[PDB]
Ligand binder design. Sequence first.
Ligand SMILES: COc1ccccc1C(=O)Nc1cc2c(cc1N1CCNC[C@H]1C)n(C)c(=O)n2C
Length: 109
Amino acid sequence: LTPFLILLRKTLEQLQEKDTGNIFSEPVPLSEVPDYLDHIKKPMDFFTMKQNLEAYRYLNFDDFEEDFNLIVSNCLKYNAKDTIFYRAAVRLREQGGAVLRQARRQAEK
Ligand SMILES: COc1ccccc1C(=O)Nc1cc2c(cc1N1CCNC[C@H]1C)n(C)c(=O)n2C
């Protein structure tokens, strides 16, 4: 499934391009944010997702979109509304939605 993996890789880069601050580029570093696991049960970030993609752990679009969504939702859930992080997650949901919709469309032809 390289036709599919070509699409996901491009789609992942497109999503990651929307992260203009590199807020979601690597995991929330748990040593630096020791209460993060108290609120967030399933952390996610673009580096992890790249590893999963390249390790063949995303069979279908849904399992890929799942992780992307965790990135957004974790961030909305952990950070106060009046934070740059929360605002970045609001943006990324809006902007990633379009990328994801077009990519699902491209899959179908
Ligand atoms: C690599 O990040 C750090 C390095 C040194 C000290 C602290 C951090 C850190 O806490 N970064 C961080 C925390 C986040 C966070 C993102 C970061 N980082 C900002 C800088 N880029 C790396 C990214 C993981 N998000 C989205 C979030 O909800 N939280 C709590």
